[PDB]
Amino acid sequence: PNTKRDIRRLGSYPVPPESKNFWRGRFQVPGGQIQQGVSPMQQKIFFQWWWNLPTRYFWRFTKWSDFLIPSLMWYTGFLMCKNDVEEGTRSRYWY
Amino acid sequence: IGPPLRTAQIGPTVGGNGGRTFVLYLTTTINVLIAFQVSWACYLQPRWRSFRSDMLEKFPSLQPDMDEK
Amino acid sequence: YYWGSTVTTEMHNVSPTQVTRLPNGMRVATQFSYTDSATVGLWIDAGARYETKESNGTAHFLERVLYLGTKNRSRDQLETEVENLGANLNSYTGREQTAFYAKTTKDGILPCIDILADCILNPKLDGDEIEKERVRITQDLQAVNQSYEELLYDKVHTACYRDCSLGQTVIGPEENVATIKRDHMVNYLYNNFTADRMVLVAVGPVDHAQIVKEAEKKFANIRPTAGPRMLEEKPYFCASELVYRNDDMGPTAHIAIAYEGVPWRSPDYITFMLMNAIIGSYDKKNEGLVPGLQSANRITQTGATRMDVGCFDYYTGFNIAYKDTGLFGFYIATDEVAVEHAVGDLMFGVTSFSYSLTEEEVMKAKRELKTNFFSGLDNTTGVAEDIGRQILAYGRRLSPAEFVERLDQIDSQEVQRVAWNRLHDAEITMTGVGPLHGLLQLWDLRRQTWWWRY
Amino acid sequence: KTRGDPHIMRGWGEYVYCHYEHLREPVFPRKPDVAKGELAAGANVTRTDVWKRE
Amino acid sequence: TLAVYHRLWGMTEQFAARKKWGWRQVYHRMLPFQIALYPSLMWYLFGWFDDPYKEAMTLGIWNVSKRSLYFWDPLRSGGDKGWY
Amino acid sequence: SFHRAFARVVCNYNKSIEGSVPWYQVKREKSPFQQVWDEVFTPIWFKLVKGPYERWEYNALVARYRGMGIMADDAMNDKDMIVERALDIIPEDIRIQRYRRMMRGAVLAGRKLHLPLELQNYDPMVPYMAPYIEEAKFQMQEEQELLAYHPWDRRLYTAGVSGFGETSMHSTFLTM
Amino acid sequence: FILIIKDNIILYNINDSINYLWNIGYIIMVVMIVQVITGIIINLYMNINNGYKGIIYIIKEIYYGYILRYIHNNNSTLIYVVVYLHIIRNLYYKTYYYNILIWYSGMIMLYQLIIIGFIGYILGWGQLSYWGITVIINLISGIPYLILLISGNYYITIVTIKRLYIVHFILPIILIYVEIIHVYYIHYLINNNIVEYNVNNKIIFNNYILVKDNNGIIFILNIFILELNNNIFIIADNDNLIEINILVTPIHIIPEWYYLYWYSILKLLPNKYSGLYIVVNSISIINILSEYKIVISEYKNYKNIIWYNQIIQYISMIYIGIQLPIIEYINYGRYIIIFNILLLIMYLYPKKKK
Amino acid sequence: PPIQKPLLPSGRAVLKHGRSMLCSGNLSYDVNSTIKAPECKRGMGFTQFKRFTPVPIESGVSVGNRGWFFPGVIPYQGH
Ligand SMILES: CCCCCCCCCCCCCCCCCC(=O)OC[C@H](COP(=O)([O-])OCC(O)COP(=O)([O-])OC[C@@H](COC(=O)CCCCCCCCCCCCCCCCC)OC(=O)CCCCCCCCCCCCCCCCC)OC(=O)CCCCCCCCCCCCCCCCC
Ligand SMILES: CCCCCCCCCCCCCCCCCC(=O)OC[C@H](COP(=O)([O-])OCC(O)COP(=O)([O-])OC[C@@H](COC(=O)CCCCCCCCCCCCCCCCC)OC(=O)CCCCCCCCCCCCCCCCC)OC(=O)CCCCCCCCCCCCCCCCC
Ligand SMILES: CCCCCCCCCCCCCCCCCC(=O)OC[C@H](COP(=O)([O-])OCC(O)COP(=O)([O-])OC[C@@H](COC(=O)CCCCCCCCCCCCCCCCC)OC(=O)CCCCCCCCCCCCCCCCC)OC(=O)CCCCCCCCCCCCCCCCC
Ligand SMILES: CCCCCCCCCCCCCCCCCC(=O)OC[C@H](COP(=O)([O-])OCC[N+](C)(C)C)OC(=O)CCCCCCCCCCCCCCCCC
Ligand SMILES: CCCCCCCCCCCCCCCCCC(=O)OC[C@H](COP(=O)([O-])OCC[N+](C)(C)C)OC(=O)CCCCCCCCCCCCCCCCC
Ligand SMILES: COC1=C(OC)C(=O)C(C/C=C(\C)CC/C=C(\C)CC/C=C(\C)CC/C=C(\C)CC/C=C(\C)CC/C=C(\C)CC/C=C(\C)CCC=C(C)C)=C(C)C1=O
Ligand SMILES: CCCCCCCC/C=C/CCCCCCCC(=O)OC[C@H](COP(=O)(O)OCCN)OC(=O)CCCCCCC/C=C/CCCCCCCC
Ligand code: HEM
Ligand code: HEM
């Protein structure tokens, strides 16, 4: 569950037995907030995928480029071993 | 009304986590013993035997073959 | 483990208690104090225990009527004389000991000896006084007019000591109270209030020689001795339940659980005093500087956490000693639904003395035991009670230094040895009043005196 | 630019930048230099005399 | 008064040593349980050992002659070579 | 009894190290061997490996925080008890902005978006939680020492709690 | 138990910001059910006296028995792929840092799964099955008379198959029970998020997360059906369709792909016992990765270099297992093992202060 | 030796508000005195069991609240 301060309830109505987990994830919101939304039945349901598509893949690739140098080094190890194996076999067996 | 007043909890707020400490101690001990066994058998043991053979080159400590112990 | 001696130079700086035996056999004990007030009284070895089943209640009746006039004086004259001296005559009667003392100014010490001697030796047990007191005693005898702590204190003795006179109550049964007459009281005075069983205790700006001279003069005609008391076996401790299940007296339940204790003169008595201090006492309405949730007392701390509410509205340990037996246990006043947690926690605490008691808890308890004892000796009446009770119990008064010397030797290991011998896997008695659905059978509670762990 | 020091921690192990740890303090903690701006909170206030003015 | 505070601060300096001692005392109280654990193990593992170790482990009380009249291997009842 | 002898050894040893200065408060001079190692290995290692690697990781972390619009101290998880105890006592104005920053970050991260660059010019490594983390550690150390210096015995599996120390009911599998 | 279902499915709250990597656990639970169901059905027709002839009988004579045979074999491959990906996921986000109880409950299911899968492979009763168990059982030849008690004879026989079959039938049912302890700890100890901190953006599971989880599990099903019916990936070695010959060894003796990592560890280290112990080390050492840390941080969302090297290290070790015991491969494999040890030490060690 | 005081020390002021040593009556027997010797209506001894706190018991009043709950709120399964 969340912190004791967060899950401390203001109301005295008992927690229903089917909502135990729901009220253990309560948060104590400081300063209030305004939440707004619209039913999906009155919205475009696929455009956001297209609108966010290029930025999603740009940030994905720039993060994954951090593994470029490690992967090249492992790949360099993969090549050396493969060709060290071939030379060893030929030297030991081939005439 | 208003935001709730600040108040510190009455501790202690930790404890009762002994089963996790046992798992830590148990796992560290096993892996430490594994380290000694692996290091001894894979590296130190063969080198000791090679050193033993070198001393045998002296031939004054040659092992009897009729000992049939 | 031994951590040193806690005796100090100040403990040795106390006026000595001088005890002398008069020729008739009355002991006279005095301690000088730099006070303007004094306490003089007679602590007599007598009580309900030494009464027979038919006469039980006579001693209490006599105590109430003793100050209601004498042969020489009258109730109005006696009350007037004491008031003119600026003093107040007090008295009490217990199962094994009785006292008749006067709190007075310095000039009234010797006059009060005369009044107390006249009351004890020449009581005018007028029939009218007896009949009026019979009405008062009868009302007192009703259970509705008694507190629940008083009821349980009597019922603990009734349950534990079924075979001997210690089970008798001081007030007595209503059948006896209805029939007591002057002759009963006159016989009790003759048999029990004898010189060999009396101690004259004077504490204040007093001189031992002067008190002795007055005592010999005023108690000259007291009966020197009475026949030796009957020889009896060790009082048998009966492991029993005596529970009054009443669901029409509100939410609070009162429970008392007892173990067999030790006599006054036992070498283990001071250990049982310390164990009583370790159990301690707690009150939700007087928590003190330290809250229950952060208490050093282990019983208190674990109790305060139960169900986020606490399972002890009130509890106290008790250690009751008699000449040849004792009772050691705890008393609880708790919510009905909390009784199983409360008895279980206070029994787990007593069982812990036999297994896992820390040096820290013992050392804290020694200091709070010493604070309680020394603070009780602050006023003259406190000193007088201590002198009189101790001389009756031990034949001598233990000095504060001696008490500390013997307490220094007791440690966690000594508590563990005594508890293992006497309290571990021991028989218990349970007594109760109020809504006690949660209280289990005696055998179930008697299995909590030992642990599967360790 | 940021005020953090990239090399605040040393030795073997996976890199990490953070400001806080769980370790215990000594009963006689180093006296903080509040005159220069150092923070005084916790043991360095209670078990020291930095708070004392003249 | 600072001296008093120094003493009050310092009375818990050795917390780690005191908590170690506490657990060492819990472990001391658990050592007696070995008296039943070890014999129970050897009791369950007795059939695993070889006969000469069975005899030594029991100080010679158990031996081949003590095997049941109807040994679980009937060809070895009365000895490894049978009764006769 | 050997336990009694062991108990005396422990008592005497601990009595002989009371008031000892902690290792960190000693004025320590490096040995003539560690000084040589610091003269040779440390400078080259910093220039070629440690310096560049740690700058690379640090600069990435600052960018990640700036993209979410959060501070470094916002990133602390309240499953850590010191963080939870510190968060109990932070003043309301600090609390309000911390919550708003953390909410914006999660929305941005969940929707795979980044904070506009117009709002990214701030230092994310300002240690605003430091006063309260230090107070919380002090409170917890006092409680550890004065109230938890021994493994206490309690009645087991009673009142919803195992009796092994935890204080919340129904907080383990065996107390369901 | 309709109010327990409602508290853990209908009104169960989860963060909105989780990725599809949080859908892996749901996939494991569903495919696990399928593997148990298809196993029970397969045993209605299977012959334990000759597993070789039972498989042929199911494939040819039973109506749609080929579906049962291939689903059970191929779904076991999917169980290990999804479980290993779940392990990689947990390592990447360091979910073990605070939710260690969840990690412990999971590792138990991992240990059980290893035993379940191996014995099942033996039930095929082919060349690799017979020779694989013969090789592995010899590892415990040090313990006296232990091999005889386990095998029930001096060589592997139908006696061994009968007893291993009971373990294969029952142990998976126990694994399902441990899945309830795993879900209990997940619901009590709230799940981690893609961000380090805890934020107020949770939504109910049934209306949002379950729809997304079904989309993922249907996408994995489109791939599993292609493999199931057309064998686009070779996931079962062909050598297990050869009848057992106890006198002649097969060309190579290797387990399924999902045991290759541990197989190579043994094949690499010279001493047999050392190889077994290093196998023990890898699974146990990852249970205490965060235990020695002292700073207030979960090491989350850095560049995760050590993580990536470790994942590639698993892949390379798996690759070396496939190859013959060439000397050059042995040398490189040993370097990888040493490299893996250093990576783990990086995880464990706490940092000093400059 | 005998113990003459309850195991739980009062910790409160003996004298009542506005009343001094001079005008408090006799603290040994005065009804309003906080240290008056209890009357042995049923005999001496029960003071070892007696609760000396003047406030009446409020059954089930909470003392185990660490700040996790507001007054009047019922914990459900400890949370
Ligand atoms: C070089 C050689 C090296 C060799 C290597 C091997 C070394 C040997 C030892 C290995 C095993 C170590 C065991 C550790 C025990 C730890 C105990 C502990 O502290 O627990 C609490 C502790 C929790 O800590 P805590 O929260 O601080 O505790 C406070 C709470 O009070 C705690 O309370 P809580 O409730 O929060 O937590 C309790 C927790 C504790 O449980 C666990 O977490 C699991 C612990 C046990 C693990 C499993 C052991 C299996 C091994 C034995 C079996 C072997 C069989 C062999 C047979 C061979 C035959 C041929 O959960 C439970 O109790 C769950 C119980 C569920 C029971 C359900 C039963 C079914 C329903 C009821 C009955 C049936 C219905 C009725 C039917 C009636 C019919 C009519 O547990 C953990 O955190 C650790 C869990 C284990 C993690 C993994 C350990 C790894 C060990 C390192 C070595 C691994 C090597 C690699 C192995 C590879 C295998 C393939
Ligand atoms: C580097 C610097 C220099 C280093 C210097 C080192 C200095 C130490 C070495 C020298 C030690 C000298 C010891 C002097 C002993 C004095 C003895 C004496 O006068 O007695 C007074 C002494 C104390 O009397 P007390 O003052 O009343 O105090 C009572 C307490 O016991 C008092 O104890 P406590 O309260 O302190 O509690 C601790 C307690 C208890 O402490 C412990 O037990 C420690 C437990 C810790 C956990 C251990 C877990 C298991 C670890 C296993 C590791 C295995 C590794 C293997 C590695 C292999 C590969 C390398 O310790 C003892 O009981 C003391 C033991 C004294 C020695 C005798 C026992 C030693 C062990 C023998 C084992 C033999 C195994 C053979 C295997 C064969 C295999 C084929 O008497 C005893 O209690 C001693 C006996 C204790 C029981 C031992 C077992 C007896 C078995 C009897 C069998 C009967 C069979 C009958 C058959 C009948 C058929 C019809
Ligand atoms: C060549 C031959 C060689 C031969 C060699 C032979 C060697 C023989 C070895 C024998 C075994 C030695 C084991 C040594 C471990 C030392 C670990 C250590 O340093 O502990 C310090 C550590 C203290 O840590 P700390 O951080 O200072 O403070 C802990 C708390 O956070 C805060 O602490 P706190 O003190 O503030 O909290 C208060 C509370 C703290 O309480 C705790 O810490 C308790 C934690 C929860 C325990 C329950 C876990 C849930 C159940 C798990 C098992 C599930 C399945 C069981 C049934 C399966 C059936 C199929 O303390 C107490 O309550 C004090 C009294 C405790 C005893 C109560 C007795 C009644 C309950 C019985 C259970 C506990 C017995 C003692 C522990 C036994 C350890 C083996 O204490 C513990 O580890 C506590 C015990 C937890 C582990 C229990 C494991 C039970 C056995 C499971 C099976 C294991 C199989 C694997 C192989 C076993 C062989 C190695
Ligand atoms: C070569 C290597 C060897 C390695 C050796 C390793 C050995 C490990 C053995 C583990 C055993 C664990 C036992 C724990 C028992 C339960 C926990 C406990 O003590 O609880 C304390 C708690 C607390 O007790 P308590 O002390 O609070 O008691 C308060 C008051 N009373 C006594 C009334 C409850 O005990 C219980 O409440 C549990 C009930 C009692 C359980 C008694 C033991 C059960 C024994 C089972 C019988 C079958 C055994 C068959 C064995 C055959 C031989 C192989
Ligand atoms: C610091 C000094 C300590 C010692 C102080 C002095 C007092 C103790 C000294 C004891 C030393 C003498 C030990 C004699 C051992 C004889 C063993 C022997 O011959 O066994 C043959 C037996 C039988 O041998 P066998 O297997 O060839 O049987 C042949 C059988 N027939 C004849 C029918 C063909 O061997 C065994 O059983 C092997 C195991 C030996 C037993 C374990 C070791 C000896 C234990 C001695 C225990 C002593 C306690 C008293 C007796 C207990 C039993 C009732
Ligand atoms: C030779 O080539 C090689 C291979 O191919 C052959 C490999 O696969 C491999 C890797 C292989 C592996 C890592 C796995 C190998 C697996 C093997 C050998 C399995 C052997 C069979 C068993 C272990 C079956 C025995 C079953 C068990 C002990 C249960 C296992 C699960 C456990 C212990 C977890 C918790 C315990 C349980 C679930 C048991 C529950 C117990 C009960 C319910 C009992 C209740 C009893 C009562 C009275 C109530 C290598 C290294 C290799 O070199
Ligand atoms: C809290 C959880 C507890 C779980 C406990 C699990 C159940 C434990 C069951 C204990 C069983 C004890 C062993 C029984 C063996 C029976 C022996 C017997 O009858 O012998 C049969 C027969 C006799 O043949 P003989 O011709 O006389 O020659 C044999 C050699 N002298 O064969 C044998 O004796 C063979 C016995 C082999 C036993 C091998 C024992 C060693 C096994 C190691 C187990 C390690 C387990 C580790 C678990 C770790 C979990 C984390
Ligand atoms: C996670 C659960 C399980 C997995 C990993 C698994 C794994 C496998 C494996 C790999 C095979 C052999 C594949 C092949 O023949 O090449 C197999 C065979 C078999 N399994 Fe399972 N199994 C599991 C559960 C079960 C269950 C619950 C049962 C029975 C109730 C079962 C019954 C069988 C049977 C009868 C066979 C022999 C048929 C065969 O030749 O495939 N399995 N198992
Ligand atoms: C039979 C195999 C297992 C199944 C059924 C399974 C199922 C689940 C499910 C449903 C979740 C919750 C949703 C999710 O995060 O995807 C989860 C969480 C988790 N699992 Fe598993 N799991 C299995 C194996 C494992 C293993 C072997 C480990 C550890 C090596 C593990 C560690 C975790 C962790 C740490 C989490 C927490 C996820 C988080 O915090 O976000 N699981 N698992």
Automatic annotation (TrEMBL), chain A:
- Top-level taxon in the UniProt lineage: Eukaryota
Q: What is this protein called?
A: Uncharacterized protein
UniProtKB/TrEMBL annotation, chain B:
- Which chain regions cross the lipid bilayer? 22-43
Family designation: Belongs to the protein kinase superfamily. Ser/Thr protein kinase family. Aurora subfamily.
Known partners and oligomeric status:
Monomer.
According to UniProt, the name of this protein is: Aurora kinase
Q: Which organism is it from?
A: Perkinsus marinus (strain ATCC 50983 / TXsc)
TrEMBL record, chain E:
Q: Where are the transmembrane segments?
A: 30-49
Give the keywords, sorted.
Membrane, Transmembrane, Transmembrane helix
What is this protein identified as? Uncharacterized protein
TrEMBL record, chain F:
- The transmembrane segments are none
| One cellular component (GO) term of this entry | respiratory chain complex III
Topology in the lipid bilayer is annotated as: Peripheral membrane protein
Annotated SUPFAM superfamilies: 14 kDa protein of cytochrome bc1 complex (Ubiquinol-cytochrome c reductase) (SSF81524)
Coarse class of the primary localization is mitochondrion
* Alphabetically ordered keywords of this record: Electron transport, Membrane, Mitochondrion, Mitochondrion inner membrane, Respiratory chain, Transport
Q: Which GO terms describe its biological process?
A: mitochondrial electron transport, ubiquinol to cytochrome c
**By its UniProt entry, which InterPro entries does this protein fall under?**
QCR7, QCR7_sf
Q: Does the keyword rRNA processing apply?
A: no
Compartments annotated for it: namely:
Mitochondrion inner membrane
Q: Which Pfam family name is an example for this entry?
A: UCR_14kD
Q: Which family does it belong to?
A: Belongs to the UQCRB/QCR7 family.
Recorded protein name is Ubiquinol-cytochrome C reductase complex 14kD subunit, putative
Protein source organism: Perkinsus marinus (strain ATCC 50983 / TXsc)
